[PDB]
Design a protein around this ligand. Structure first.
Ligand SMILES: [Cl-]
Ligand SMILES: [Cl-]
Ligand SMILES: [Cl-]
Ligand SMILES: [Cl-]
Ligand SMILES: [Cl-]
Ligand SMILES: [Cl-]
Ligand SMILES: [Cl-]
Ligand SMILES: [Cl-]
Ligand SMILES: [Cl-]
Ligand SMILES: [Cl-]
Ligand SMILES: [Cl-]
Ligand SMILES: [Cl-]
Ligand SMILES: [Fe+3]
Ligand SMILES: [Fe+3]
Ligand SMILES: [Fe+3]
Ligand SMILES: [Fe+3]
Ligand SMILES: [Fe+3]
Ligand SMILES: [Fe+3]
Ligand SMILES: [Fe+3]
Ligand SMILES: [Fe+3]
Ligand SMILES: [Fe+3]
Ligand SMILES: [Fe+3]
Ligand SMILES: [Fe+3]
Ligand SMILES: [Fe+3]
Ligand SMILES: [Fe+3]
Ligand SMILES: [Fe+3]
Ligand SMILES: [Fe+3]
Ligand SMILES: [Fe+3]
Ligand SMILES: [Fe+3]
Ligand SMILES: [Fe+3]
Ligand SMILES: [Fe+3]
Ligand SMILES: [Fe+3]
Ligand SMILES: [Fe+3]
Ligand SMILES: [Fe+3]
Ligand SMILES: [Fe+3]
Ligand SMILES: [Fe+3]
Ligand SMILES: [Fe+3]
Ligand SMILES: [Fe+3]
Ligand SMILES: [Fe+3]
Ligand SMILES: [Fe+3]
Ligand SMILES: [Fe+3]
Ligand SMILES: [Fe+3]
Ligand SMILES: [Fe+3]
Ligand SMILES: [Fe+3]
Ligand SMILES: [Fe+3]
Ligand SMILES: [Fe+3]
Ligand SMILES: [Fe+3]
Ligand SMILES: [Fe+3]
Ligand SMILES: [Fe+3]
Ligand SMILES: [Fe+3]
Ligand SMILES: [Fe+3]
Ligand SMILES: [Fe+3]
Ligand SMILES: [Fe+3]
Ligand SMILES: [Fe+3]
Ligand SMILES: [Fe+3]
Ligand SMILES: [Fe+3]
Ligand SMILES: [Fe+3]
Ligand SMILES: [Fe+3]
Ligand SMILES: [Fe+3]
Ligand SMILES: [Fe+3]
Ligand SMILES: [Fe+3]
Ligand SMILES: [Fe+3]
Ligand SMILES: [Fe+3]
Ligand SMILES: [Fe+3]
Lengths: 165, 165, 165, 165, 165, 165, 165, 165, 165, 165, 165, 165
């Protein structure tokens, strides 16, 4: 059946994306610098925990429908399909920019996956909607730092050495 | 007796002000944007919980001296007597400005109320002093973002698109 | 897109209804009287906490799909579209009657909203199903006080001064 | 030895009675209606937890003296030897009446069992005294709703549509 | 000094009243019967804990200003100056009636005591205001069972065998 | 309406299956023997708690859409429609075999039920997807003991006296 | 039956003794002075909590076998039958002496009561054995301060102004 | 009196046996090896905690009836009267065999002791029944690994290098 | 205004005294010796925590009325105005003597301060009454070690090498 | 300085090894199969948490001595220098074999690193000793499954389809 | 011996530095102002707790090797040997600058002390390495606000009124 | 290798000493008498828990470097090499004297062991430094009861029947 194939594909692809996000949030947690370093250090820890919890649920849902889960380092690298986080000290505006985009792209892809599996496997779809919920919430939490308002454009000039982000 | 009338007036007026503050802190919690969005999101959650706890105490003190408590939406609107929080995305400096002022005006009014009821109802006065304590603490916590220091005026230029707040 | 418009409408309308319910449950929590006053005081506190939690989730889901959330007192009043709770001391049977109806009407409307947004935004639909779940559970918990049984009609005569409710 | 037979009989018969009580308390927890529905819903949850804990202790005491424990649905039905709880919506006075009687009859039987095994197996007797303690406490908690006092017969007329229970 | 005498008198008299209330709430906790027996059993436990906590604070405030505290059974009996709770099974309406009155009279007396010691010993006055706060809250919680409303007089006929309380 | 009939049928049938599973997991918890007795004793306790929690949710969802819930022993026996667990001491491989199958069949049936009620009652469907999620997870947890791998068939010979399971 | 009379007598007499002990331990908790004041203040708090817990169990066991419980102040005074604790500041050696004796006499009496009711009411006997257990443990904890050892008589001279206790 | 002698003997002999068991369970906790090493490591930790708790209760019951408790290493060695646990790495089947026997022999002896002291000291008998309860439960938990079933003899061949245990 | 000056003076002077007390209680916590060393080590830890909590409240009340708080080491030294605690190993009687006096003098001064600010700033007065409450409680807890009783002068001879304190 | 270079090298190399171990333990947690699947699932979760905690400490120690931390997926792959865990369903004996070896090799390398940095950076050495402690403990916990004993070689034949591991 | 002298010197000097840091972190906690006031208020509270915990460990290690600990205010002032924190309102950039430097200098000195005592007193050295660990971590946490990155120098211009820090 | 021999010797010898201390602290916990009996009862419980925790760590470190741990009663007796605690009732001064000495001698020996294994096994050395830390802290806590001060020799005359200890 390509109803098991559909399920596996959607779960496995989401798992890898969450694992990529685990590694990038931690990396940023450690290396972020600037005015918002501590704020972001704390926020990224919370995201990491939420992402880790859903990575474990997604992997065990995969096992639950009868397939092994591939969480290997090689598999994470092989699925790049997503900008990589710079090494070294990272700037607060750079971290914000980076996750605004990553969470948005990951959320979009999960959104597609929910549609794909919804009538063959509504239980897997339900799980993926929960993952999408958290990813899009995290997206807002990064986006909110640069959100345009009636009194202030929020260009990020102050967290970016005078320059818009 | 206008010793029950005094007590009711002081308690009821404080209740409505706290309920107005519940709604405005939550609104700001959701909609705040900019460099300090997350910081303020967390701080406003703490204030909301403190305000909610005292709203419940004030309402039940009113019941305790023998009068019903009016916590209706219509009553909150009817007591405006206090600037309203803008809708839409709100800027961090705008939120700070707004609560610096609201908490100050609410604290002042409670201060007056403590004097009013102190010898007819010292138990109600004691409660209102506790409310004033928390409101003025919250006032300092908003004020501290723009507090002038020997090395830095803290105009809020960085959180306000180059302009003093 | 009127897929963002659909989502915003469903989320915003639900938020206001939950906020209306926050205010009415608390009001009843304070002012309820009679044989079941304490029972209802405790039950209404539990409902208030459940409703408050989902109000926060609904507002932040709205932010998560890119729109501000309107939780203002004026907006609650403006959306009346729902009977208002009496002021003053409220009778236990009156509170029961009132929420049986409110929860039922709010649950119905959320039910409609779930259908409306389900294929444009299954993640928002999932959240609203969770809200509907709790609202309808609360509906049963109010309804159960007057539920007709094989041995007893449960007219509420005992909690209503000899008269059916 | 009919000292193991004695022990097994007393433990097994008590286990089945507790399991019958697990099912009836939950059933009543869900279906109770009327003025005391919520009160009883909460009280029956507490009883269910206490009963469940002792069912587990009784079953594992049976294993501890070297015999398997029969907790099957068929065995519960086979040991009826005890009125069955009506299906459908149940009235508060009906639930109270029902458990007043069930707890009393179960407590009596355990009381007999304590005497039976006390000198062959004082450790099993000790456990059964603890079960009897809780069952008789629960009996008082149901009985107390209809307990005659110097100022009021407590006929249950108010929770029974004008009629004594 | 009769500023220590004033303080001692106010503290000691309050201690005895709280201890009288400890004994009466527990007695009622055990012996209450009728429709509201369990409700009142739980409510009276909460009051007992609040009263016990303040009895300990009042006694240790007495020690703190340099005097021993008399918490003896003989002293409780000697200070009757307050209706005694009936023995035997007590009816729910009887318990409600009884504490409505006791809490009211105790609250009144503490209120007087606050005035008496307020300028010689504002710290003792502060403590007594906290005791008055809780006692009057408990008074409302008993009073609320019989509170007259626009739709229902709440005579207590249902919890009193057809007769107003 | 046969939209309430649909909902009731799906909820009621699931409730009975969960209650059957409550009884069988506990039975196995007590009576399991062999190399994996303690492992399974602990695992079956965890399943029992998860199953019990969802049984309570399913029963109260049934009440929430306006129908009583039938959790009686007779009803559990009447719905057999599912192999019964042996009495006496049960072998670890026998327990594993038994639940691998039970959880699989129960999960399948819930899966069908989700489809059945999904557009008349998406809130009930959502609940049943959560039940299916847990049941299928539990299925994997039993299946994993005998799961074929590249280095070892996992026949269960070691937990079955030399014989494949 | 004088098997209910036996049970009531044993339970009621124990309740009063525990309540007497509640009042005396608290009194000593507040008023104790000297080298061991703080030690004893803490120890007496622990005893008070243990005694309070068993007073509640004894009273509710009395209700459980169908009789009201008399916890009134007048009843405590009426059952003196036991030395009274001095008022005023109490010396550490005096407190130790006093409870060594009280706990011993109360433990003895409960011991007799266990024999009295053991075959009419083994469940009540079991409870009273638990009370005796704690009372005799508390007796050792007071006795241990003056316990004669091979290297030191422990006369209490140091806690008694040079004089043996 | 040889009623104190009886009590002391029963308590002291049980204490030493529990202390012997403390040392053997820990030893096995550390040194166990094989397929069931981790399972047994965890199970033996739980037993150790239960045994330690009762050792403390038994020793303090001894003090409570007026005698010192001998918990010395020399006394443990002197009371051997019980097979000693091998040193070095211990096999899972060896640990299981060993405690099946130890717990059984210790439980038997405590059982005798309960009879011995039951009418001179029912409070000490009650404590020893609680110790026997736990010891026999632990006995079942070890025995269950090798328990014969209708589908599998459970010889332990798999945990014993092909050989029955 | 010298109503802000009054408030600042009272708050600042209390802060410094509490900080002096933080340092002295810890110093004594570490260095106390003798019969009551451990008792006092524990008691002084509790006082330190209570004092630290109020130091933080006093400092933040100062900020709340618009002034900075001076908690510097130099400021603590500059406000000596209070005996200094000896260095080196400190004797139990010396610690008791020392805090009996310190707490008394600090409590007195706070008492004066409460009067000073009570009508310009009742909220600050309320806070200072809470500080006075704890300081005077701590005073009793030190005083109680040497408190004269009808049976024993409590000279402290035993904790002072034969000599009255 | 090549004292910062030394520190960075030792910390960075350890971080990557811990991150490799995070991924492999989770992978095994999900995919392990066979008799010991659940046991190992639980054990590997505990190891994962311990490893994750030290990965965070090692990365933040690196930041603490002034260097960024590289936790990227590419860096984990680039440092292979260590056998990779198979994908697909993994057998219990295979998991045990695999971590016995991995933990041993990682522990050895950390051991070397402790020597390397010990006198330039004893604080980093201290941290690495703590990491080595946990890694070697985990090594024993895997090794213990196959540990040779006087009564049983523990070849793993039972967990490996008749064949030694 | 000047091995006790060495130990005392290293411990005592570290204690004073930690106590200086306790006072400065709290001072900054209260008085910090500007964009990062709340962030720093929270961060400085965490540091204060970590510093307080190690101050207590260092003082009690000093006692453990047989010397008293000097924690007096005079001793803190006497050891200045370290810039003092300004009084009045302090700017966020000023606080960051100040602790970046203080933590660095304190960490350096502890580092030296670890070398000094390492072979006379490795247990004291171990403790001091733990103190150094936390101090240097806190140093990074302050330093990270101004850490230069590839996209942004992080001069602190935004938190310093346009000027580099 | 005699680097494993060194490690084993140091770990095994420490384990036995900690186990000896477990037994002696408990023995003293039970049997201590006199003025400081309760104080010491509590203090010795805390030491016992700290000692037990490190005994478990030391034994599992031994396993971690590849050797079994000998925790047998016979081995404890065989390693006497340390005064034995008297049986019977023990005097407070005797307990203090005894542990002052035991902890000192055990701490000394561990100190030697740290030197012995430090460069072959720094991870084992680190663990032993932690054990030494706690043992020497416990030594101070016993020593502090008799510590000579400028105002009082602390001979223990008061806790020793007039005689210096
Ligand atoms: Cl899980
Ligand atoms: Cl409340
Ligand atoms: Cl949240
Ligand atoms: Cl259990
Ligand atoms: Cl307290
Ligand atoms: Cl619930
Ligand atoms: Cl209870
Ligand atoms: Cl205890
Ligand atoms: Cl705070
Ligand atoms: Cl952290
Ligand atoms: Cl500590
Ligand atoms: Cl562990
Ligand atoms: Fe967090
Ligand atoms: Fe998992
Ligand atoms: Fe999960
Ligand atoms: Fe930046
Ligand atoms: Fe918060
Ligand atoms: Fe409330
Ligand atoms: Fe409250
Ligand atoms: Fe802004
Ligand atoms: Fe609640
Ligand atoms: Fe929120
Ligand atoms: Fe939420
Ligand atoms: Fe959901
Ligand atoms: Fe009514
Ligand atoms: Fe409950
Ligand atoms: Fe169980
Ligand atoms: Fe249990
Ligand atoms: Fe009814
Ligand atoms: Fe309660
Ligand atoms: Fe107290
Ligand atoms: Fe208190
Ligand atoms: Fe009634
Ligand atoms: Fe569990
Ligand atoms: Fe439920
Ligand atoms: Fe639930
Ligand atoms: Fe088997
Ligand atoms: Fe306590
Ligand atoms: Fe109770
Ligand atoms: Fe109880
Ligand atoms: Fe018991
Ligand atoms: Fe004395
Ligand atoms: Fe455990
Ligand atoms: Fe103990
Ligand atoms: Fe215990
Ligand atoms: Fe084996
Ligand atoms: Fe404490
Ligand atoms: Fe603070
Ligand atoms: Fe505070
Ligand atoms: Fe207050
Ligand atoms: Fe002294
Ligand atoms: Fe775990
Ligand atoms: Fe971190
Ligand atoms: Fe950490
Ligand atoms: Fe295998
Ligand atoms: Fe914190
Ligand atoms: Fe300390
Ligand atoms: Fe510490
Ligand atoms: Fe360490
Ligand atoms: Fe600034
Ligand atoms: Fe403790
Ligand atoms: Fe262990
Ligand atoms: Fe440990
Ligand atoms: Fe002595």
């Amino acid at each position: 059946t390509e109803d098991l194939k559909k399920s596996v594909q959607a779960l496995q692809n989401t798992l890898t994306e969450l694992q990529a996000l685990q590694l990038q949030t931690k990396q940023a947690h450690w290396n972020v610098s600037g005015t918002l370093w501590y704020t972001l250090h704390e926020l990224l820890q919370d995201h990491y925990e939420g992402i880790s919890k859903f990575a474990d649920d997604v992997a065990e849902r995969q096992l639950s429908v009868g397939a092994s889960s591939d969480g290997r380092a090689i598999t994470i690298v092989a699925a790049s399909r997503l900008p990589e986080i710079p090494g070294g000290f990272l700037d607060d505006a750079q971290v914000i920019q980076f996750f605004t985009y990553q969470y948005e792209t990951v959320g979009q892809r999960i959104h597609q996956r929910v549609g794909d599996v919804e009538k063959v496997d509504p239980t897997t779809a339900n799980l993926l909607q929960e993952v999408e919920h958290i990813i899009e919430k995290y997206q807002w939490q990064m986006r909110a730092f640069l959100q345009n308002t009636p009194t202030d454009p929020n260009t990020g000039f102050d967290i970016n050495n005078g320059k818009p982000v």
